[PDB]
């Protein structure tokens, strides 16, 4: 299995390097196709090798997979299969950290929470890959309050690092009751840039395909690179009037790092995007919106 995992990683990295080249080759092909369909000059760049691209156009069909995408390779089983989520904490967790980790299990459908004892980080990832765990969550705390969250996609998927700002848990609020636990509807708002689309994809694939009649809503709203997490259930008292009751934890997210590899590959994986706070114009710049 270890040899198979290494082989699949080299296949994934090889395809990622050549992704840009195929896109440019594809783009040149469409420009030639328009020139053929509407009688016009072949572009001077496309004047040479025009016959070869014309030969390719005959060979293109719906059967082929098309141009590859590194995002699609990472989230291959996003729609077909339900995700499997595992939640763990840092070593020797606090009392309130264990309480926060208990609530995150309730939020994610099908999630499981396991005790972190003397487990090496690399050993944890090996067990998750063997048993088909899709996504792994690690949460950090400071003085009894959650402060950091790491989301890792197990099959050599991207690893995202977050910092929590304003955490309010259900356990602090008295007499709430029990949660709905239905498959939730997802609301994504405020993500307009390319990076914002990248981040929202990671958060959305943590959840399974819901039902049409589900009354459970989870909202991710972006405002000045700060992502607000909200959980709600709605009741239609009458037409056009709907009531909202807040349930579940409430906290804020701020992304600062995305790495290509898994969290066991800190010393080897490349950084897709990093936040640079010492840049001369870092104060007046945002990255999650345009």
């Amino acid at each position: 299995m270890l040899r198979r995992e290494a082989r699949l990683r080299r296949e994934y990295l090889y395809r990622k390097a050549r992704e840009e080249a195929q896109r440019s080759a594809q783009e040149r092909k469409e420009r030639l196709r328009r020139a053929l369909e509407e009688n016009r000059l072949i572009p001077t760049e496309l004047r040479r090798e025009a016959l070869a691209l014309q030969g390719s156009l005959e060979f293109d069909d719906a059967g082929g997979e098309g141009v590859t995408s590194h995002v699609d390779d990472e989230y291959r089983w996003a729609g077909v299969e339900d995700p499997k989520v595992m939640i763990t904490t840092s070593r020797d967790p606090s009392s309130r950290l264990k309480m926060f980790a208990k609530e995150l299990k309730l939020v994610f459908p099908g999630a499981q929470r396991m005790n972190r004892g003397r487990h090496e980080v690399g050993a944890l990832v090996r067990a998750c890959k063997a048993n088909g765990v899709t996504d792994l969550l690690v949460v950090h705390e400071h003085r009894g309050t959650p402060v950091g969250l790491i989301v890792s996609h197990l099959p050599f998927g991207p690893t995202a690092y977050f910092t929590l700002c304003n955490v309010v848990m259900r356990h602090d609020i008295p007499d709430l009751g029990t949660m709905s636990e239905a498959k939730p509807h997802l609301i994504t708002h405020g993500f307009s840039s390319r990076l914002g689309k990248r981040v929202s994809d990671i958060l959305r694939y943590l959840f399974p395909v819901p039902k049409d009649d589900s009354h459970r809503v989870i909202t991710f709203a972006n405002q000045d690179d700060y992502i607000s997490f909200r959980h709600h259930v709605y009741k239609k008292t009458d037409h056009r009037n709907v009531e909202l009751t807040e349930v579940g934890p409430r906290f804020e997210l701020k992304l600062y790092m995305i790495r290509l590899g898994t969290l066991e590959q800190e010393a080897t994986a490349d950084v897709e995007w990093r936040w640079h706070p010492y840049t001369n114009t870092a104060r007046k710049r945002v990255f999650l919106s345009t």
Binding site: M1, L2, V80, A130, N131, G132
Partner: protein, 408 residues
Amino acid sequence: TFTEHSSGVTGVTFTATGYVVVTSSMDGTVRAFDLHRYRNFRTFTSPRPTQFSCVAVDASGEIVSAGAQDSFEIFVWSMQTGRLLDVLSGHEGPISGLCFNPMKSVLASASWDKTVRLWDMFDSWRTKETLALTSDALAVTFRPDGAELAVATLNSQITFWDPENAVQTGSIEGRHDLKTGRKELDKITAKHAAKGKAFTALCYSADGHSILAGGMSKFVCIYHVREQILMKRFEISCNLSLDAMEEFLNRRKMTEFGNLALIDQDAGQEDGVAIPLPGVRKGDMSSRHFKPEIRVTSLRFSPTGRCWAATTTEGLLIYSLDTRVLFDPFELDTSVTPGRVREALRQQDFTRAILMALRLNESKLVQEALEAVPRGEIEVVTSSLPELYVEKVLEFLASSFEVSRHLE
């Protein structure tokens, strides 16, 4: 004959109660067939395109299980529902084989990561057990009572474990016993090849006191499990028109430039029908088809216990119990002789004659003794008969119903 499967059949089995047969194929399908209506009523396939290598069914028959070449995971389906109950993961490498406990309804699966894993189906907390091995595992079988497990390993060792306690009861070394011969095209010798070959087929007897093993040889080895010795070696075939039958190839066929097997190869391939293709191990298009190598592909023993069968390259071989093979008396004495038997028959002392004829294990003497007794004295003889001889009389009666005119 059923022809629904398009590609090769990897494994077959029978359900414990009904006349239902379950089959797995390289099509990616496991199909179930009934002998009452002769139809393929149920078909199981994986959500992901995978090909299956073996099949196992529960004694209850509600559970169907299969293993894969590549996805390295066990797929378990419900018989009555027809939907995929679960996928078992944790093994690394292809799965050697699967088998259900006859009495406990737990699954044992061998893998090439030197592990045999036990899976509990009807367990609320999903208990799983791991048995580590020193070498690669190839086969797993349960004793009919279900209290013992056997694993064949790549170092040619058969290890017997206790499943519930996860303790290794015993071990048997069998590399020397699996005598292997050199193929005509092999550059290496028989010993060097044998150093890398192990048993590939195991089978318990009905009583469980002996085990049968087979592989890349013309020999099937029967071992006594408790004494860990080879009781007997059977020669499946003596045909010398099959490759690798003899350890030492004939010095007569050598010339200066070797044995020149390719010329005889092409003479064999003059059969036509298809075209040989380089690198195909088996089939019509295989290069080595006219003289296939000798192999015991599978072994099985009858639940009845009077015969056993083996699938080999020659065909399907059946071996049955025969009295002529061995003389096995139970409790002999100088008084025990057929003359005294017929004497006691003449004085109408039926019980003593029948008992002393049963101390002998010649079937004709007990046949004459039982047929000499007139009706109405049957109950007296049955009451006088002790407990130990009851099983002997039942076995003789069961043998008798087949070939006796006097049924009732």
